[PDB]
Amino acid sequence: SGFRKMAFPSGKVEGCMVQVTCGTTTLNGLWLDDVVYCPRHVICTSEDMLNPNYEDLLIRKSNHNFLVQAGNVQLRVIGHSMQNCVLKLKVDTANPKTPKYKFVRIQPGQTFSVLACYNGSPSGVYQCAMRPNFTIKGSFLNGSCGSVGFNIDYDCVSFCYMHHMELPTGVHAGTDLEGNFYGPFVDRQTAQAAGTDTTITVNVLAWLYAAVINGDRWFLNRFTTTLNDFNLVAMKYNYEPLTQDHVDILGPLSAQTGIAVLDMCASLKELLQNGMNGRTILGSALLEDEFTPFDVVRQCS
Amino acid sequence: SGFRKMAFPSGKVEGCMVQVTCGTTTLNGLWLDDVVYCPRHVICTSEDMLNPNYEDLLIRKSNHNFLVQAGNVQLRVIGHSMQNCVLKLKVDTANPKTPKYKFVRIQPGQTFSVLACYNGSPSGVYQCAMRPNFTIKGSFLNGSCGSVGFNIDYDCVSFCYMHHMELPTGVHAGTDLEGNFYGPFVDRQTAQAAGTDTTITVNVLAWLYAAVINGDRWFLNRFTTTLNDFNLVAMKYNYEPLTQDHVDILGPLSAQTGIAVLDMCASLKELLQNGMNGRTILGSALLEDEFTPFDVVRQCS
Ligand SMILES: *[C@](O)(C(=O)NC1CC1)[C@H](CCCC)NC(=O)[C@@H]1[C@@H]2[C@H](CN1C(=O)[C@@H](NC(=O)NC1(CS(=O)(=O)C(C)(C)C)CCCCC1)C(C)(C)C)C2(C)C
Ligand SMILES: *[C@](O)(C(=O)NC1CC1)[C@H](CCCC)NC(=O)[C@@H]1[C@@H]2[C@H](CN1C(=O)[C@@H](NC(=O)NC1(CS(=O)(=O)C(C)(C)C)CCCCC1)C(C)(C)C)C2(C)C
Numbered sequence: 043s044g045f046r047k048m049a050f051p052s053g054k055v056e057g058c059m060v061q062v063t064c065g066t067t068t069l070n071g072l073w074l075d076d077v078v079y080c081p082r083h084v085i086c087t088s089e090d091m092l093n094p095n096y097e098d099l100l101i102r103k104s105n106h107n108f109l110v111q112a113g114n115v116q117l118r119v120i121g122h123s124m125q126n127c128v129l130k131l132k133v134d135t136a137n138p139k140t141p142k143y144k145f146v147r148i149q150p151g152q153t154f155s156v157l158a159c160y161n162g163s164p165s166g167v168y169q170c171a172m173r174p175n176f177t178i179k180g181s182f183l184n185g186s187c188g189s190v191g192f193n194i195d196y197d198c199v200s201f202c203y204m205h206h207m208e209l210p211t212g213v214h215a216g217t218d219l220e221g222n223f224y225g226p227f228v229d230r231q232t233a234q235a236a237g238t239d240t241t242i243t244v245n246v247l248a249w250l251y252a253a254v255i256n257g258d259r260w261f262l263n264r265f266t267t268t269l270n271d272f273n274l275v276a277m278k279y280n281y282e283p284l285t286q287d288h289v290d291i292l293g294p295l296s297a298q299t300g301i302a303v304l305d306m307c308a309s310l311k312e313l314l315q316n317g318m319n320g321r322t323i324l325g326s327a328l329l330e331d332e333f334t335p336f337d338v339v340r341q342c343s
Numbered sequence: 344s345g346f347r348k349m350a351f352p353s354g355k356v357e358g359c360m361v362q363v364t365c366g367t368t369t370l371n372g373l374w375l376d377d378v379v380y381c382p383r384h385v386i387c388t389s390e391d392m393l394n395p396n397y398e399d400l401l402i403r404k405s406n407h408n409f410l411v412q413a414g415n416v417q418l419r420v421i422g423h424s425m426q427n428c429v430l431k432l433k434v435d436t437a438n439p440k441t442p443k444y445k446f447v448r449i450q451p452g453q454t455f456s457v458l459a460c461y462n463g464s465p466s467g468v469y470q471c472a473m474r475p476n477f478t479i480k481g482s483f484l485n486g487s488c489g490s491v492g493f494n495i496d497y498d499c500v501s502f503c504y505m506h507h508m509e510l511p512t513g514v515h516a517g518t519d520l521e522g523n524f525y526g527p528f529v530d531r532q533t534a535q536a537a538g539t540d541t542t543i544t545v546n547v548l549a550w551l552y553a554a555v556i557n558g559d560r561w562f563l564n565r566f567t568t569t570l571n572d573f574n575l576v577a578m579k580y581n582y583e584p585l586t587q588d589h590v591d592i593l594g595p596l597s598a599q600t601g602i603a604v605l606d607m608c609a610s611l612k613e614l615l616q617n618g619m620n621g622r623t624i625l626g627s628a629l630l631e632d633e634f635t636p637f638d639v640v641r642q643c644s
Binding site: 044046051052056158165166167170180183214256322327340341343 | 344345346347348349350351352353354355357358458459465466467468471481482483484509514515557558623626627628629641642643644
């Protein structure tokens with residue numbers, strides 16, 4: 043037993059991470075088939091970042107201005123193009139370690155694994171969640187842009203995220219693998235507000251079920267609630283509203299524990315109104331909302 | 344920036360995880376060169392677990408009683424032997440994905456990455472620490488025995504742990520890759536007490552430096568302490584004693600922040616005596632002790 047924040051095995055993704063250097067900037071790229079994907083602001087100087095015309099900047103770039111490197115292998119760029127915010131660098135060599143993959147755009151509240159890399163070399167792996175305000179709380183230093191987020195579906199690598207920027211809060215923002223940013227953000231160095239962040243309610247309940255599965259039951263109360271009355275408490279504490287879909291998703295967790303979703307919501311109502319009173323849940327003194335119901339079921343079966 | 348619990352890339356280890364089935368038991372094995380390493384109690388029935396004579400049990404086993412499987416490949420066992428608590432199954436095929444590796448026995452307080460597997464297939468990756476009482480807090484279901492812990496040193500995979508058992512506490516215990524158990528534990532299903540667990544003090548200080556690097560400074564006080572006076576507070580709260588070696592190890596973190604180790608210990612003294620008063624440090628309402636000074640420096644450079 044035991045419950046830990048767990049990331050997918052990164053082996054299939056490590057063989058796709060390359061180094062991309064354009065002039066003075068070095069970051070990471072994703073090498074699938076014969077294209078290297080990377081954030082388009084690799085072509086920007088520190089001055090260009092303030093107000094870039096990416097179409098004009100890319101025009102002044104030739105193929106030889108991009109030094110792509112996969113370990114010791116050096117990949118020829120035979121062309122370059124732009125897909126909304128990502129630079130697609132066509133190379134003369136197909137990646138022999140290219141896995142079976144898809145490009146997916148995940149929903150707020152869903153989780154994924156990030157393979158943090160620096161100068162094209164993988165550094166570490168950790169699990170993240172797409173916050174309701176379309177940011178993520180990760181660990182990205184200078185040189186980590188281009189690192190990708192992914193899920194492993196059956197026998198398929200589903201790329202969902204590529205890191206671009208850091209927020210004044212300390213949270214991070216990026217795009218899908220088609221270059222479309224998650225959230226209202228644009229790749230320009232200017233003031234941009236992230237939305238008020240809320241707590242993923244269905245994730246908290248899935249995490250409370252994980253605690254019940256692992257023996258932690260002190261928060262279970264013998265009261266129940268309604269979807270309306272709970273959602274009144276939820277919006278007071280900036281918890282995102284619970285729907286009947288969320289109840290159905292938690293079905294496998296409620297069936298395993300024999301505790302209905304509306305029963306668990308009464309326990310969560312008490313925890314929000316009274317706090318934890320000095321106790322812990324799964325070794326945490328705070329409510330955790332970065333485990334999807336799938337993540338919990340994945341770690342219990 | 345940002346600070347997250349991070350595990351090493353698992354690609355080099357995934358290509359070594361195989362399935363080991365002996366009679367009715369299925370668990371994981373480690374396929375290096377031409378040997379498969381796995382916990383020796385794979386040969387035990389549920390009845391043998393209570394009081395096993397592993398020498399007598401292994402004698403009744405032939406080579407054909409071990410079904411080893413690497414995905415679809417089926418590996419011939421051409422011999423079997425015992426190295427203290429691990430079964431070494433010699434196979435007729437050398438693993439072509441064998442990386443450069445060593446077998447190391449880590450110290451209490453050090454961390455490593457666990458590649459959790461089930462039926463020989465990798466499931467997830469997460470970071471763990473060898474507690475002072477030689478247990479670990481991981482996520483191991485039925486079928487996870489045989490999963491290994493490892494560090495990646497420069498260009499070398501240092502295997503340090505193989506999972507064997509679960510404790511009544513919910514914590515886990517295992518051996519090094521030479522079959523020697525961490526802690527006083529034996530591979531027998533009988534009452535065995537783990538030692539009183541203590542908090543890794545040098546790890547807490549490294550985690551407090553990480554918070555200072557990432558902007559969290561509310562706990563810094565303008566007092567300092569001595570190594571003696573702090574160790575008096577440390578033993579009261581079951582914190583393991585701080586030595587001059589621990590001070591020297593934190594050198595890179597104290598130099599980056601300009602905050603001496605004895606200064607940070609006065610902040611930790613206040614946090615233990617007064618609690619957190621409702622605030623958080625790096626998004627946690629509890630003191631974290633599973634980040635080594637190396638882990639923090641690794642995530643900041
Ligand atoms: C990344 O490309 C990288 O790893 N580069 C390698 C070469 C070193 C790099 C990583 C930076 C954080 C470690 N990313 C960037 O350089 C991006 C691109 C330029 C600016 N940043 C960036 O991360 C900015 N953040 C930023 O500008 N964020 C905002 C504006 S803001 O922070 O509110 C402020 C007004 C500037 C204070 C704009 C984007 C949306 C969020 C807010 C920092 C370098 C300041 C962290 C691009 C094009 C965004
Ligand atoms: C592992 O081999 C596996 O994944 N097997 C696959 C086939 C399903 C398996 C995992 C069990 C937890 C998920 N490990 C074991 O079967 C080991 C071996 C037998 C018993 N256990 C084991 O984990 C025991 N734990 C246990 O006996 N622990 C103690 C004794 S105790 O828990 O205090 C008690 C007195 C029994 C209550 C002995 C070892 C040291 C710690 C205490 C449980 C199955 C009960 C979890 C071996 C040889 C230890």
